[PDB]
Amino acid sequence: KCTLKSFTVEKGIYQTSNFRVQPTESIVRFPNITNLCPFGEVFNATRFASVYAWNRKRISNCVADYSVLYNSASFSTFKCYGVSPTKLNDLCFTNVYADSFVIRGDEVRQIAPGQTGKIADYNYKLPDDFTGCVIAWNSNNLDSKVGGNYNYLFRLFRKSNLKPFERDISTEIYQAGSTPCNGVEGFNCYFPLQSYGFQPTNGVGYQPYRVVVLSFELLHAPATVCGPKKSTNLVKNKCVNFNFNGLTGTGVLTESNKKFLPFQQFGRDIADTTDAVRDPQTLEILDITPCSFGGVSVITPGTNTSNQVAVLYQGVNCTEVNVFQTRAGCLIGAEHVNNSYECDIPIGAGICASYQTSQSVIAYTMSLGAENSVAYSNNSIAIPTNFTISVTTEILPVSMTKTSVDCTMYICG
Amino acid sequence: IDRLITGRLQSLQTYVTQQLIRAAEIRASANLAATKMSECVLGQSKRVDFCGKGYHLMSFPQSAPHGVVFLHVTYVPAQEKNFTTAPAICHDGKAHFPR
Amino acid sequence: DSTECSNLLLQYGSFCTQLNRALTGIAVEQDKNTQEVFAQVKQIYKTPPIKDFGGFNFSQILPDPSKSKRSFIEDLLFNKVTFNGLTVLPPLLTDEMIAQYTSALLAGTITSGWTFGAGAALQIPFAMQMAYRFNGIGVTQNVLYENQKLIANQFNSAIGKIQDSLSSTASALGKLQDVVNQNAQALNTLVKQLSSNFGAISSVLNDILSRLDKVEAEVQIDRLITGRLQSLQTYVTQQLIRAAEIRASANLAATKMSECVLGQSKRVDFCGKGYHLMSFPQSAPHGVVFLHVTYVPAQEKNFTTAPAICHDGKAHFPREGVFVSNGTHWFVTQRNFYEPQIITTDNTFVSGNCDVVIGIVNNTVYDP
Amino acid sequence: DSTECSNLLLQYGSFCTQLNRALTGIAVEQDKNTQEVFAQVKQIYKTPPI
Amino acid sequence: AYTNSFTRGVYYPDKVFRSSVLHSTQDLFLPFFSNVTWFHNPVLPFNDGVYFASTEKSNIIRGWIFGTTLDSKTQSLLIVNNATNVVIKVCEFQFCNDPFLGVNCTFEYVSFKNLREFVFKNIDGYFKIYSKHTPINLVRDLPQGFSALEPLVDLPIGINITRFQTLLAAYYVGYLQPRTFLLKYNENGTITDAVDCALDPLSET
Ligand SMILES: *[C@@H]1O[C@H](CO)[C@@H](O[C@@H]2O[C@H](CO)[C@@H](O)[C@H](O)[C@H]2NC(C)=O)[C@H](O)[C@H]1NC(C)=O
Ligand SMILES: *[C@@H]1O[C@H](CO)[C@@H](O)[C@H](O)[C@H]1NC(C)=O
Ligand SMILES: *[C@@H]1O[C@H](CO)[C@@H](O)[C@H](O)[C@H]1NC(C)=O
Ligand SMILES: *[C@@H]1O[C@H](CO)[C@@H](O)[C@H](O)[C@H]1NC(C)=O
Ligand SMILES: *[C@@H]1O[C@H](CO)[C@@H](O)[C@H](O)[C@H]1NC(C)=O
Ligand SMILES: *[C@@H]1O[C@H](CO)[C@@H](O)[C@H](O)[C@H]1NC(C)=O
Ligand SMILES: *[C@@H]1O[C@H](CO)[C@@H](O)[C@H](O)[C@H]1NC(C)=O
Ligand SMILES: *[C@@H]1O[C@H](CO)[C@@H](O)[C@H](O)[C@H]1NC(C)=O
Ligand SMILES: *[C@@H]1O[C@H](CO)[C@@H](O)[C@H](O)[C@H]1NC(C)=O
Ligand SMILES: *[C@@H]1O[C@H](CO)[C@@H](O)[C@H](O)[C@H]1NC(C)=O
Ligand SMILES: *[C@@H]1O[C@H](CO)[C@@H](O)[C@H](O)[C@H]1NC(C)=O
Ligand SMILES: *[C@@H]1O[C@H](CO)[C@@H](O)[C@H](O)[C@H]1NC(C)=O
């Protein structure tokens, strides 16, 4: 009634809707998680840098779980700039630079984009538009020693402040006086390198802290660093939503005989539709079948005669949806009959339906007419002894209603 | 306004295209109805099933809105009997065939 | 199944409903086209158990119960012709029902002649039916009964060449194969147009949504919607134009069913070349095949002729036939087969006198 | 004959192939239409001199 | 010296299975019946990409260098067969200006009887290598026949490449150009034949 925009419906079969099986769950597949970035040194190393001599790893051609940097309680502070800490595992980059050093616990707040202070001015400078993150933690258990660990140092002055990622380890004499120092101390000429002398009994602002700064870039050269890839279990024979190596789709996955060559990953149909996939972990080939769909047709006598109906799910197997399978589709609410009649409402593939004997919709194989052996032999003839004058009525269309549209009044008006 | 012009102009092009295709279908039916007027109202067709089932005697036009109705009058044979039959008969050693 | 795209497609209103209404009218018409050709028979006639057809050998064209119970030639015909929301619907009549109709049309034709089209099938012996079909082309029926084994051998031999021809060319069945190829090429074009950009960032609809903010993705999707909707309107318009061409061909096949199979057409070259005797339907994929049987005149001789003959001052004209001479003697023959009769007052009729007619010749007319 | 426009027209896919295919089918039909009408004669018959 | 390339230098354009079907593709290909340089190790242009082949029974070719300088000033690609592994290194090498092999960096990787065939191309910051090996029965030219090259490695290197040289009894060099090819995939999904659509009017047909 709502398809026809009417309260009265004539006898027929009407497509009112489309049926479509929904994906039962989502699946994701990627290759075995492998080739961890070299952070297994960076957060475990016995040695570490003086801040005037900061040590850089270059990170490339690898993956890592960047969530561990704040999911693990091993690190006393984590910060991020441009990027967000919860987002890191979704990202990819051309290079990452992992810069590492020891500082005292009072210096930690200087490690941010574009700052000024004894570290930023004279030891390690970050740019104003920095993209990346910082790990910082107390290292009094690693970097302090009895009587003082004098092996850790900083620069107290420099002739000019450091440029972004400038790395000045030189024994340069700082000049504050009007006379040049010529590589030796003198009138306002100073050797600027100073030791921390870290001790286990220091107050927290004087205790050593380790820092690692992870610095991100994406270039004209392609990405080589990424976060980890998830992988679900694999489900066959159900309709699912799916993703294999970033190839997304939806359908029914089934085992297949198709032998892909060792480098091939996807199969394609004659019209370039994907018809099979290699699983990226257990290297079987799966056929992909579309998730089942078709028109829905309502089969009705006229509403002058009954409010009962049958429903046809066109081309659908009744397993996916009285209930009766026909080659036209799954037919519901119609009684299958072993008799045959003239076709009333046409269902398809030799099947028709009607409303008949408590009366219900019936479905039957259509009858082409009464069977007849003509009484032929080489010497028998039949001759008509009488006739009937018949008057047939033939109706033919001859004209349409003549229409004119002023297209300027229709479009604009 | 250019989105309304674009959609209303495409809407009107769709209408005129399907009316051109439907007019061609009505012209084929008018050409058939004009051929049944000549061959069955103005004549007696010997073409099988052109003017009703059975052997055509005559037909009559009646007007209907947007169309024509033909009342086709036909002879239908009704009450047959079986007989023995032969292609020819002998007489004076010659064969005879029905004229 | 993109919900972001689905909400934009609602802005276009009735377009998606009227595309389906158009293709539904096309689909319903294909069942009517098929019904009007094959369902011309009121009763399912069946052929007798013994084939006493006067030497004419219907066996290549009648049902084979060892097979759908197709004929031998219908099996050659069926061997020779060979999911993005898109669906193919079955025909109403199955290929076995189409073959039960061509079986009934053929069995009625063989056992009863033209009579099963005008009323009840009235049996007649097949050699007597062919004698009437010879009279229908203006050849006297004694020409058949005197040549019956020759005529039957020429028919059986000519049907044998249909098996050979159908086993050894595609050039004839190219009409049905082209209808298969055009519909397959149209659906391939419709599916390949999903890979087109139409000026959008991508042809992949999830790849738009997963890489752009809402208002930007919306503007890119509307280009895919515009191009894919124009791609459907182009397909449905082209299927409407092609369905009108198939309907013209189905109306012609329905007319050859009535006039060539249920009758004997007098229309020149309607039921094959030569004077049409009869024809037989065979079913084929998406079509019908007519085996048109025709009389072709084959070995002519030159004769002298005259429009009339002059007797007792009376001008005589032939009742049927033409006056001819072999150079020395005058005879009247039927017009389509040389069979000279001696000229008599009952071969002929008088009109006026010899002074009027241009080219009259002087002769005896025998009075029996 | 603009190269800049041609590379934009490639983004519309099969539309420009099926327009040329439609007009080629119409063109081949006109020669068929002509041979259905006039080529109904097997041999080129001639009238006599008298 | 020069020789005809015949129908050689085809490679699988993408990692896609297709079967018992014909597929049309545009890519950098060695054109059919093109003219290729023959050597019995100068620096050569790379152009859009290179087809390289050697006819061999004694394994004399041991590697290649690709880049702009192939020497010290700037980054470049070195490829060497170390007999136990293929080795790839991407560096501004201090290595020889007239190199031979016998008895900083941004990337690294570790793995007549015969025609050994290779294709090198460098697009969208990725360096592609394809290859095939076959037995042969001819010395005087690249043997008439068909054999598609499979992808070996597909490297995220990002470098501008314009020239190359061999490291090392005879080898051939041909240049890839943008062409449309029609490729025949059999039931096993192997490429078994091809048409160069620009070769001649029958190939356009
Ligand atoms: C024209 O036809 C007549 C047929 O009657 C031919 O005349 C007959 O010829 C045979 C021998 O060939 C005789 O036995 C008959 O007695 C003849 N009949 C008559 C009525 O005389 C005649 O020969 C034919 N003429 C030509 C030139 O072929
Ligand atoms: C991935 O891991 C599973 C389980 O350890 C193993 O069976 C499989 O072989 C691995 N994948 C590949 C590509 O070898
Ligand atoms: C699908 O339909 C067929 C009959 O068409 C039936 O045999 C089969 O059992 C159905 N599928 C399933 C999964 O049951
Ligand atoms: C209908 O047909 C089926 C299959 O032939 C048979 O099992 C059933 O008993 C029949 N029922 C009736 C009432 O004829
Ligand atoms: C006699 O004629 C009738 C009417 O056509 C027919 O039903 C019957 O089969 C014929 N007789 C025989 C013996 O077949
Ligand atoms: C012929 O049929 C009519 C009825 O249509 C009947 O009245 C008449 O008696 C019949 N005549 C014969 C000879 O059977
Ligand atoms: C008819 O033709 C078939 C072959 O088509 C042949 O086997 C048969 O003997 C012929 N005669 C009869 C009476 O069937
Ligand atoms: C005699 O008839 C033949 C066959 O039709 C014809 O070719 C020939 O031209 C005729 N004779 C003369 C002298 O023209
Ligand atoms: C036929 O033509 C000839 C010349 O060819 C002429 O002499 C004769 O009078 C004509 N006869 C008739 C009946 O026209
Ligand atoms: C035909 O016969 C009549 C009467 O015998 C005669 O007058 C006339 O001249 C004859 N004509 C010819 C053409 O021989
Ligand atoms: C191959 O290149 C050389 C370059 O000098 C030229 O002489 C020769 O004609 C070319 N051959 C063909 C077949 O183009
Ligand atoms: C196709 O693959 C199977 C399995 O490898 C093989 O047996 C068959 O010979 C192959 N067929 C062809 C034509 O290459």
Curated annotation (Swiss-Prot), chain D:
Sum up the protein's function in the record's words: Precursor of the fusion protein processed in the biosynthesis of the S protein and the formation of virus particle. Mediates fusion of the virion and cellular membranes by functioning as a class I viral fusion protein. Contains two viral fusion peptides that are unmasked after cleavage. The S2/S2' cleavage occurs during virus entry at the cell membrane by host TMPRSS2 or during endocytosis by host CSTL.
Protein name per Swiss-Prot or TrEMBL: Spike protein S2
The organism is: Severe acute respiratory syndrome coronavirus 2
